[PDB]
Scaffold this active site. Structure first.
Site, PDB file in Angstrom:
ATOM      1  N   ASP A 141      -3.108 -14.593  11.756  1.00  0.00           N
ATOM      2  CA  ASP A 141      -3.328 -13.186  12.066  1.00  0.00           C
ATOM      3  C   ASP A 141      -4.509 -12.593  11.318  1.00  0.00           C
ATOM      4  O   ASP A 141      -4.432 -11.482  10.784  1.00  0.00           O
ATOM      5  CB  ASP A 141      -2.080 -12.351  11.782  1.00  0.00           C
ATOM      6  N   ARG A 145      -8.268  -5.543  10.376  1.00  0.00           N
ATOM      7  CA  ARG A 145      -7.157  -4.709   9.926  1.00  0.00           C
ATOM      8  C   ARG A 145      -6.411  -5.339   8.764  1.00  0.00           C
ATOM      9  O   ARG A 145      -5.886  -4.627   7.905  1.00  0.00           O
ATOM     10  CB  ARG A 145      -6.178  -4.436  11.073  1.00  0.00           C
ATOM     11  N   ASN A 146      -6.385  -6.671   8.733  1.00  0.00           N
ATOM     12  CA  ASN A 146      -5.684  -7.404   7.688  1.00  0.00           C
ATOM     13  C   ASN A 146      -6.480  -7.831   6.461  1.00  0.00           C
ATOM     14  O   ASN A 146      -6.075  -8.743   5.732  1.00  0.00           O
ATOM     15  CB  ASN A 146      -4.998  -8.625   8.285  1.00  0.00           C
ATOM     16  N   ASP A 159      -1.512  -9.600   4.613  1.00  0.00           N
ATOM     17  CA  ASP A 159      -0.632  -9.712   5.772  1.00  0.00           C
ATOM     18  C   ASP A 159      -0.312 -11.129   6.238  1.00  0.00           C
ATOM     19  O   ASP A 159      -0.962 -11.660   7.137  1.00  0.00           O
ATOM     20  CB  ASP A 159      -1.193  -8.885   6.927  1.00  0.00           C
TER      21      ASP A 159
HETATM   22  C1  LIG Z   1     -10.120   7.318   5.131  1.00  0.00           C
HETATM   23  C2  LIG Z   1      -9.158   6.150   5.340  1.00  0.00           C
HETATM   24  N1  LIG Z   1      -7.778   6.643   5.316  1.00  0.00           N
HETATM   25  C3  LIG Z   1      -7.411   7.039   3.956  1.00  0.00           C
HETATM   26  C4  LIG Z   1      -7.574   5.859   3.003  1.00  0.00           C
HETATM   27  N2  LIG Z   1      -6.766   4.721   3.454  1.00  0.00           N
HETATM   28  C5  LIG Z   1      -5.333   4.911   3.215  1.00  0.00           C
HETATM   29  C6  LIG Z   1      -4.747   3.582   2.753  1.00  0.00           C
HETATM   30  C7  LIG Z   1      -4.896   3.184   1.441  1.00  0.00           C
HETATM   31  C8  LIG Z   1      -4.372   1.973   1.020  1.00  0.00           C
HETATM   32  C9  LIG Z   1      -3.702   1.157   1.910  1.00  0.00           C
HETATM   33  C10 LIG Z   1      -3.173  -0.046   1.476  1.00  0.00           C
HETATM   34  C11 LIG Z   1      -2.442  -0.875   2.206  1.00  0.00           C
HETATM   35  C12 LIG Z   1      -2.115  -1.905   1.451  1.00  0.00           C
HETATM   36  C13 LIG Z   1      -1.385  -3.053   1.658  1.00  0.00           C
HETATM   37  N3  LIG Z   1      -0.833  -3.311   2.825  1.00  0.00           N
HETATM   38  C14 LIG Z   1      -0.281  -4.644   3.044  1.00  0.00           C
HETATM   39  C15 LIG Z   1       0.269  -4.744   4.457  1.00  0.00           C
HETATM   40  C16 LIG Z   1       0.840  -4.898   2.063  1.00  0.00           C
HETATM   41  C17 LIG Z   1       1.611  -6.041   2.177  1.00  0.00           C
HETATM   42  C18 LIG Z   1       2.636  -6.274   1.278  1.00  0.00           C
HETATM   43  C19 LIG Z   1       2.887  -5.368   0.268  1.00  0.00           C
HETATM   44  C20 LIG Z   1       2.116  -4.226   0.158  1.00  0.00           C
HETATM   45  C21 LIG Z   1       1.091  -3.989   1.057  1.00  0.00           C
HETATM   46  N4  LIG Z   1      -1.237  -3.922   0.664  1.00  0.00           N
HETATM   47  C22 LIG Z   1      -1.776  -3.691  -0.512  1.00  0.00           C
HETATM   48  N5  LIG Z   1      -2.476  -2.601  -0.743  1.00  0.00           N
HETATM   49  C23 LIG Z   1      -2.659  -1.694   0.214  1.00  0.00           C
HETATM   50  N6  LIG Z   1      -3.308  -0.545   0.256  1.00  0.00           N
HETATM   51  C24 LIG Z   1      -3.549   1.558   3.221  1.00  0.00           C
HETATM   52  C25 LIG Z   1      -4.078   2.766   3.642  1.00  0.00           C
HETATM   53  C26 LIG Z   1      -7.051   4.374   4.850  1.00  0.00           C
HETATM   54  C27 LIG Z   1      -6.861   5.590   5.743  1.00  0.00           C
END
Ligand SMILES: CCN1CCN(Cc2ccc(-c3cc4c(N[C@H](C)c5ccccc5)ncnc4[nH]3)cc2)CC1
Length: 306
Positions: A141, A145-146, A159
């Site tokens: 995947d 986005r990931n 992811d």
């Molecule tokens: C102008 C852009 N807008 C505001 C800023 N961001 C908000 C945002 C900030 C951080 C995250 C973020 C997602 C994320 C993330 N997601 C994955 C799927 C995840 C998987 C397992 C455990 C934790 C997270 N993992 C680790 N750190 C992360 N940080 C997502 C959205 C994007 C949308």
């Protein structure tokens, strides 16, 4: 083969204070938050993901598979699991990637993203993937986005809800049905449901396309049913405006029928490195926290015996 000696860390819920939602995905909410280890006297920004809300034994199986894979990786360009918390519902806790995912990021910053970054990120993803390849682990995947932004100069692959370990020295992974991101899938993954490190390459080819078109939608317009065919006829994604033929040429290679003709993630690293040394010759672009952060540290800095 080799025994997986990763240490899955169990975490008390009193050990971390949630602070806000970042992604209330249909599949499950994801939070911003802080983690303050046992008695360690450090706070660590973290992302916390629990399976939506309700506990359906069916869903629980997959979130833990992710936890499994994510706890088994250790590379500067892959997101590692910090540990799980077994409250009423299961939570995955990992280091915080403040700036969110790369896709949104390019969209939000087109007028300020230079060639140096684009190629530099292309290098970092090639590295992350090469790592997974070494760990005999197929992502399945890979997409813009990931990939998450730690800093603008540091991206990591995340992811693993669909990753797959490769055993009995088998090469092509045969899978089930469900929901699969067609537009980013290799041809084999579409016709024979065969997946492999080389199909990851293809997805990489589309990921690089995403970043180069500043976050466009592949095959936009088109519909997934239509896809397999097209690709079958010979059609591929177009060359992005800012793209030299050299760069687009590498994208096209990740998309060749004979899966062994595509570049290995280790070659893609080398090739992009060369280009990153002279970013302007390969890309043409017009113009090229509310705590006693006193004891705040960053995962990549918090290590424990191993
Ligand atoms: C102008 C852009 N807008 C505001 C800023 N961001 C908000 C945002 C900030 C951080 C995250 C973020 C997602 C994320 C993330 N997601 C994955 C799927 C995840 C998987 C397992 C455990 C934790 C997270 N993992 C680790 N750190 C992360 N940080 C997502 C959205 C994007 C949308």
């Amino acid at each position: 083969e080799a025994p997986n000696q990763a240490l899955l860390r169990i975490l008390k819920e009193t050990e971390f204070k949630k602070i806000k939602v970042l992604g209330s995905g249909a599949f499950g909410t994801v939070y911003k938050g802080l983690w303050i280890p046992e008695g360690e006297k450090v706070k660590i920004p973290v992302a916390i993901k629990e399976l939506r809300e309700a506990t359906s034994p069916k869903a629980n199986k997959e979130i833990l598979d992710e936890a499994y894979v994510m706890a088994s990786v250790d590379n500067p360009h892959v997101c590692r699991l910090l540990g799980i918390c077994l409250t009423s519902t299961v939570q995955l806790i990992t280091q915080l990637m403040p700036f969110g995912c790369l896709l949104d990021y390019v969209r939000e910053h087109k007028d300020n993203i230079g060639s140096q970054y684009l190629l530099n990120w292309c290098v970092q993803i090639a590295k992350g993937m090469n790592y997974l390849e070494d760990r005999r682990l197929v992502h399945r995947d890979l997409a813009a986005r990931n990939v998450l932004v730690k800093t603008p100069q540091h991206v990591k692959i995340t992811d693993f809800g669909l990753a797959k370990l490769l055993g009995a020295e088998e090469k092509e992974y045969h899978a089930e049905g469900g929901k699969v991101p067609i537009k980013w899938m290799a041809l084999e993954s579409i016709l024979h449901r065969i997946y492999t490190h080389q199909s990851d390459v293809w997805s990489y080819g589309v990921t690089v396309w995403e970043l180069m078109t500043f976050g466009s939608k592949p095959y936009d317009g088109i519909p997934a049913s239509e896809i397999s065919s097209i690709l079958e006829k010979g059609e591929r994604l177009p060359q992005p405006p800012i793209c030299t033929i050299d760069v687009y040429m590498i994208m096209v290679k990740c998309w060749m029928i004979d899966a062994d003709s595509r570049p290995k993630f280790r070659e893609l690293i080398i090739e992009f490195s060369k280009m990153a040394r002279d970013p302007q010759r390969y890309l043409v672009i017009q113009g090229d926290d509310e705590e006693d952060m006193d004891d705040v540290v960053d995962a990549d800095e918090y290590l424990i015996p191993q």
